[PDB]
């Protein structure tokens, strides 16, 4: 059992790379055992606002999730306010009412993809998410800030920096491997790192 949420920068900085991002998300999902009693998948786009695209309880199989990803259109917007988006996910998407099994101790894995420095502070939100049971993996593309992605990530090791959307496919296996590593037992041995700025 895993709840896997993709939080995707949909600001204008991502417009040209968005089809490659959609491809990447599908590559990860295809590796997961998707179903209500196994892996649940959600996806939220964000810029200076958030837009849930589908929730952990929306689909019950691989076809449903993949079809939903394929149909995404870019949210748009000037900036990625990543900190606000992270808290929005914690408080609204990692919830029992929207299909999260957080209350039962199911891993809450949050894969964040962005291509620019955040338009807001991610430090405080990162603390709140780690204290609240989220396990984030920050994937910074291009101009994304390395420190920010490390800060967001449950521990810095989990963060990834890749120079272009073109290279995003080259990390799909290690992201899949991380999702596998992070079961309830492994997470039991892992503690998050909190040392803001």
Residue numbers in the entry: 1024 to 1220
Reproduce, without paraphrasing, sentences from the article in which this PDB structure was first reported.
Collagen VI is a ubiquitously expressed extracellular matrix protein that forms a structurally unique network of beaded microfilaments. All collagen VI chains consist of a relatively short triple-helical region as well as of N- and C-terminal globular structures that are largely made up of VWA domains. Von Willebrand factor A (VWA) domains consist of about 200 amino acid residues and act as interaction modules in many intra- and extracellular proteins, e.g., in copines, integrins, von Willebrand factor, complement factors B and C2, matrilins, and collagens. The collagen VI α3N5 domain structure is the first solved structure of a collagen VWA domain and differs from other VWA domains in having an extended C-terminal region comprising residues N1206–G1224.
The murine collagen VI α3N5 domain was crystallized and its structure solved by molecular replacement at 1.2 Å resolution. The crystal asymmetric unit contains one molecule of collagen VI α3N5 comprising residues E1024–P1219. For the remaining five residues, S1220–G1224, poorer electron density precluded unambiguous model building. The structure has a central six-stranded hydrophobic β sheet flanked on either side by three amphipathic α helices. Like most of the collagen VI VWA domains, the α3N5 domain does not contain a conserved MIDAS motif. The C-terminal extension comprises a short α helix approximately at right angles with helix α6 followed by an extended region that cradles between the α4 and α5 helices of the N5 domain. Closer examination of the structure in this region shows that the extension is linked to the core domain by a salt bridge formed by residue R1207 from the C-terminal extension and E1024 from the core domain. Furthermore, residues L1210 and L1213 pack into a hydrophobic patch (patch 1; Figure 3, dark blue) formed by the residues P1130, L1132, V1158, and L1205 from the core domain, and a second hydrophobic patch (patch 2; Figure 3, light blue) is created by the side chains F1177, I1178, and P1179 from the core domain, which is buried by P1215 and I1216 from the C-terminal extension. The last two residues of the extension showing unique electron density, residues L1217 and P1219, interact with a hydrophobic ladder created by the long hydrophobic portions of the side chains of residues R1146, V1150, and K1153 of the α4 helix (green). As a result, the N and C termini are at opposite sides of the domain, which allows the formation of beads-on-a-string assemblies of multiple domains.
